[PDB]
Design a protein around this ligand. Structure first.
Ligand code: NI
Ligand code: NI
Length: 165
């Protein structure tokens, strides 16, 4: 019962691969991606990912419908929207690319969710506010910070841990 969390891969192929290996060498039932993958060829790398995918559109992802298609061709279960609102392992998630701050801020403040995941900032953080678990996996690419990361959330114990690439 492990869920992989990643974001802002920014076409960095090598790190996208280290991320896909790490996720496989783990249980990881599903992988959430918020960031901008950005280019279509990034999705061909994902055909090698075991887990189903839940993605969100980044403000940099230009090929929106084409991206949804390729994602599904890789697996009809995979989904991608601007905001994903779902329940997994008896926990209620709100996923989005940090992209729109007002919405992100409201999702945490509302208390309608257990876990909230976002990216955009490329600034990994992992905090708690009003019993809401707020997670930002950080930048898989490592461009702004020089520290490439991803993360893995234990659904039953509610335990998280960053993973430096
Ligand atoms: Ni970005
Ligand atoms: Ni962004």
């Amino acid at each position: 019962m492990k869920i992989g969390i990643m974001s802002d891969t920014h076409d960095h192929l090598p790190n996208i691969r280290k991320a896909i290996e790490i996720f496989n060498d783990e249980n990881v039932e599903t992988v959430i991606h918020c960031g901008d993958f950005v280019s279509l060829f990034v999705i061909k790398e994902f055909e090698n990912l075991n887990a189903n995918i839940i993605a969100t559109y980044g403000n940099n992802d230009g090929e929106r419908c084409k991206l949804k298609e390729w994602l599904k061709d890789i697996n009809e279960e995979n989904i991608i929207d601007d905001f994903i609102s779902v329940e997994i392992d008896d926990l209620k998630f709100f996923i989005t690319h940090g992209h729109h701050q007002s919405v992100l801020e409201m999702a945490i403040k509302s208390g309608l969710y257990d876990v909230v995941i976002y990216g955009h900032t490329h600034e990994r953080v992992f905090e708690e506010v009003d019993d809401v678990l707020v997670i930002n996996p950080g930048e898989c690419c490592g461009y702004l910070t020089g520290i490439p990361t991803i993360g893995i959330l234990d659904t039953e114990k509610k335990e998280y841990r960053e993973i430096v690439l």
